Every structure is written in structure tokens, then in C-alpha cells.
Amino acid sequence: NKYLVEFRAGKMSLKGTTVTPDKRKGLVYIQQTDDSLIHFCWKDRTSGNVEDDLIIFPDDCEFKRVPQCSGRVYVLKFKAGSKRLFFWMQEPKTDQDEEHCRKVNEYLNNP
């Protein structure tokens, strides 16, 4: 039931070629359900609403920093850029940003 990885982060939305932040306080986390499937999730830290809940298998996606912004923007990108989910880090310090990125990739692509 415990989250395999978690970190505060907000969402962003891409329209045309412009990516704009959602202002909400949020939490990205990875969790294994009782049926052993791996879920990548985002929840509103204020309301508690789980707004994104994706079931991920190895080689579906990669989590990578977005140099275009540094605003600490990361994107979850599905195979052939079919889907992109953008996030901005909300941890007060940057010291774990890269390790959070490594752990996301590890648990999604080698759980």
C-alpha cells in the first residue's frame, strides 16, 4: 500500500506549443496495487483528489527533464510521443530532483 516513490509536484498543460502551469499543490507517486500492477499517479494535495492514475509496463514511457524551461519541469512521455504529461517540482529544495527522476524511471521500467 506504501508509495514506492513520491514527491511534491504540480501539473502543466500543453496547448499548441505553449506549456502552462496548473497552480495546484500536488503529489506524484508510484504505487503497486494488490493485483501487482504498477501505477503512476498524481493527486491534489489540497482536496486529496487522485486525478491521474496510469498503469505502466516496462518500455511504455520515460520520465525526463524538460530543458525548454530552469523551472524544474519534467515530462512523462509515452512511446512515439503519443502522450505527454508535464509536471513542475514543488519540493522546496532541488537536491533530490534528479534522484526522483531516476527512481521514477527505475520503478516504471524495472519494477
Binding site: 500543453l14 502552462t20 496548473d22 499543490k25 523551472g71 513542475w88 514543488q90
Partner: peptide, 12 residues
């Protein structure tokens, strides 16, 4: 304290 949102940006 918690960071403010980044400014919008272009993604090509």
C-alpha cells in the same frame, strides 16, 4: 516555503 509556478514556455 514552496516554490511558485514557473512561467509558461514554448515546447516544440
Amino acid at each position: 516555503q514552496e516554490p511558485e509556478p514557473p512561467e509558461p514556455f514554448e515546447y516544440i
